[model samples]
Target: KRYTITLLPGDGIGPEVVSIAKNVLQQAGSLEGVEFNFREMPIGGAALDLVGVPLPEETISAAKESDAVLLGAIGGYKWDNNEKHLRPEKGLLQIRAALKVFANLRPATVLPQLVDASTLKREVAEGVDLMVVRELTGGIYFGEPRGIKTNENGEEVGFNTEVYAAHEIDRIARVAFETARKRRGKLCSVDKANVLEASILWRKRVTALASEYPDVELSHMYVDNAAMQLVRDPKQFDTIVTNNIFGDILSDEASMITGSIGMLPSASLSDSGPGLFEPIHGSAPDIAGQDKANPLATILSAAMLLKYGLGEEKAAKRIEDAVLVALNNGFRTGDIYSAGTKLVGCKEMGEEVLKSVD
Candidate 1:
């Protein structure tokens, strides 16, 4: 099988880590008896400098034609001060919007390899494995009637609405249910039902959809309580489904709970189109060009691209197993490094994973 993959190494250590993932993918593809045709494109600050926009039209078209997209982090200090439209983050938002990727799958798994890195007590953080199925679109982020206004009292109020159409809730809930079916068979739909009509409808729709997936047990939790339980007893949860903003906060908290963001990968998918896969970390400009960046998350994202995006389970498992081998053998990047572990730079780490893949 041959797949065309788009590479967007936006900024900072993005170039370094993405290069590593591309190499890993190539190695895995060859071993799995498949081939990959890679297309390099620019977005974020890089595109803003080249074409006066954060997301270029050509990049979008190229990505749309590909089997999947692997993005490294975007938004560095260089473009942090740019206007909202020109900011590097805008490119990320634009690409996801352009792709119509509504379901964002973020997994927080505490690998035995890095369990000691957890901030929580060993027993509390030991076996936490969960997926946050987030609705990426149609929330306050894209809600209408949002702006700063000076009211009759001469006071300024900035506000944005949290809104979710029933269809949006249904689709994301379906993804959560299917995801749960593949895992621990437990789905928790979280929202603020006591207030916010949006959350009220969110609960109603998800509850209604539960009858269709009776095999997958479903539960409901208020966002606030869900956050508390995530820290208090994370193991109790398996699959979490929530709206955009809640998922955003909850996933980040979950990622950190696993120890290192450098070990987590996310897959944002649309109903019909290529999925965008990437590490959940941002561009660490302070570490850019230093080789201190961790390539594992990005490498694992390549695994996600293979498994979730292209349905090449064999090749994906190869990448994942290689990562485990590399970790078990004591390879570490600066971010995931603890005392006594072999500290390696980003490139060498990728080479370790590649060699393990063999």
Candidate 2:
């Protein structure tokens, strides 16, 4: 299928990694017979520097005009002291808001070749393939009345609202159920239903949606317990649905189970609107222009762009398989390096994956 994609090379090492991914994807078009039109746009700290804001009008307009947007990474130490509106993170959050992207699909899979790279034993990390279907636009991260305040006694109090509407819950819940149907027919909804009002709503909405998918296993757990279970044994889960705040914390924690942040890819999606795909890691400003950053995460995110955004699953799987083969051959970048693995830069890794596909 032919598609138009907006590419944001963001900032710092973002350009370094994104260039490799774009090249690999372009190379894949010859094998898969899939065509794409790529357009580059500014974002993150770079955009802030150029346009005086992180989320420039041109960037948002480009995103709105494309089938999907692929981001490399955002932020750097340069914007560390910036104001709230001008922060590098604002670009990412603004895009999610503008695109109306609701569900964030973060798959935490431990490739057989990299099982040894994890801190956990191979047995614990082996055979682990799970996706976190997190609600992006709602919950504590965006809920109203979220800020620090003062009590009657002049004592400082920090508060953030954790609220969800029925539609918001239903949309993300449906995403989880559909994902479960496509995967292992298992879905786990995590929340504090026994305590928080927001979690109660989330649990209720997800339960009602599960009725239509009787073939899919449905279950619930508190956020705290779920966090413990994720580290203790992550393989027990197939698909996890949770609110934005909880998902943010859990997914970052879950990345460890797979062994390297450099190896994880994520998709932030909406029901009918265009999605934004990117890696979970930030710009390696310290290593920028040094050819030291890993590009697999960004490459895999492009694969996600092909699968979820362009409806090209086979092309996406080809990218996934190529990455697996590349890693198996002991081609290592500094981020995921270990003994005996050849340390390659971003370009070499992309070439390795492209060669694997051939």
Candidate 3:
């Protein structure tokens, strides 16, 4: 079957890496019964330069018309000092909200060969595989009364409301349980119920949802303790479902356990709307145009697009298998290159995966 994809190569190495990923996708698309039609657009800094907005109308329109969307990373030093409202992050938030991608699943697995690369001890990092299901659209990031205010003593204070209604918790928790059922059948609901009223609500609602997934071992942990548990013994966790704030911090810490930020992929979805698939890494502006950034994350995101959004499991596995084979063959980019490993360029690294696929 042929699929239509809207491509937003945002900024920095975004365009370059997106190009390589698309080339590999073309290779995957050439199979006996598949094809991919890519509609490319400018976004992030590139969009702002051309259209005066980080997220251009053309880009959003293209995304709405496609089967799914593929985006490379965004953000750069040039826009670093810009006002918060006009920053590149706003484009990301707007796009995600505009697309209504409410549930985000990010898996952090310590690949066998790179186990020693992690800061975690061998035993703690060994066989560590955890999937973090984050509630995307709700919580503090979008909450009301989130600006600087004057206190009784005339002190300026800025605060964000940590809020999530029952339905928000119910929906994301259900997604987490469904994910847990598919992998290891164990779900750890992370929240700070002992303190925050919102966390209290989150814990109560998740506990209520646990009844629906009897086969999945469900548990809860205060967010702080969960943070400690992650470093102490990461392998103990199978899947963690948490609110937006905690998920934002925990996932970055969790990504470090794998020792390669570029190895992770994420899927952001909602009840309606086409899903969004992308890498865990940001636009490596320092290495932009140098072909020094890794393409694994973006490539793996394509695999996610196949498995989760398109229901092409076999193709997804094929892509993952190819990645492993490339790594096993010592095809390393500068970031992961150990002594004696064959260092390859972004395009070359992508070709290595394509060759492994063959």
Candidate 4:
């Protein structure tokens, strides 16, 4: 089978990690008798420099026509001072809005090989694997009636609305339930129903939807408790679905329990059209050109692109196994490095993974 994959190596360490991921994909494709036609494009600050906008129309058109998109981190200190619409992150938001990918899937799996990297007790961190199904495209981030205005007191007040239509809650809840069915048959919906009216509606809709999936056990937890539980005992949950802001906060917290954020990857998807797969970490401008960045998350994201985007489970598993093999051989990047493991630079680590695949 043949596929069209779009690569957006935005800025900072994004180019470094994405280059490694593409090579691994090519090697895996050759072994699996599959063909990948790759198209490289620019976005974020890189696009702003070349074209006067953060997200060009041409990049969106190309991405929509492709089968899947693999993005490196976008944004750095160089573009941090730019205006809201011109900022590097606006490109990411615009693309997601254009694609209408409402669900963000972030998986945090604790590999036994890197158990020592976690700050948690080894026993607590080991065997913990969970998927955070975040509701994208809605909530305060995209809500209207949000801006700074001077009130009657002549003081400037800033505000953003946290709103979710029933359809929005219903759709994300369904994705969470379906995902849980394939996993441990447990789904936890996190919300602050006791406080916010929007969350009250959120909890109601998700509860009503739970009856449709009786086979899957459903549960609920407030966002605060959920955050505490993630570090206290992360294994108690299996699949979690929450609003945009809470999921954004909780997923980062969850990433630390397993290891560094550098080791995590995410997939933002919709019911149709092309899916966007990327590492969850931001572009670390401080380490942009240094060989200290880790490429494992980006590599694993390519694995997800094959499985979730292209329906090539065997090829996906091949890349995943190669990553495990590389780790078992004690190859460590600077972020996950520990006492006995042989620390390698970003390029050497990619080479180690490629060797394992061969």
Per-model CA lDDT versus the true structure: 0.92, 0.88, 0.86, 0.92
Report the alpha-carbon TM-score of model 4 versus the true structure: 0.96
- Cα TM-score of candidate 1: 0.97
Two-way lDDT contest, 2 vs 3, winner: 2
Stretches off by above 4 angstroms in model 1 are none
Residue-wise C-alpha lDDT for candidate 2, range 1-358, written one tens digit per residue? 6778899999988998888888777767657887778899988898988888898888889899998888999989989999888899988889899999899999999988788878888889998889999989888777788778899999989988888889989989888898888789999999999998888988888888877889999999999999999888999999999988899889888888789888899998888968999988889898999888899999999899888787777888888889989998999999888898898987788889989877
- What's the lDDT for candidate 4? 0.92
Question: Which tens-of-lDDT digit does each residue in 1-358 have in candidate 3?
Answer: 8999888889888888888778767676565357889988878888877887788777888887788888899899988887886788788888888888888999999988677778888888889999999999999988986999999999999898888889999999998998898789999999988889999899999998877888999999989998899889898999999999899999989998778887788988777667888887899898998878889889988888877777777777778888899999988888888787889988889889989776
Candidate 1 lDDT at 97 equals 92
Clashes per model (N, Cα, C within 3 A):
0, 0, 0, 0
Q: Each model's TM-score, in the order given?
A: 0.97, 0.96, 0.96, 0.96
TM-score of decoy 2: 0.96
Specify the poorest-scoring 10-residue window by lDDT in model 3. 24-33
For residue 167, give model 1's deviation from the true position in Å: 1.0
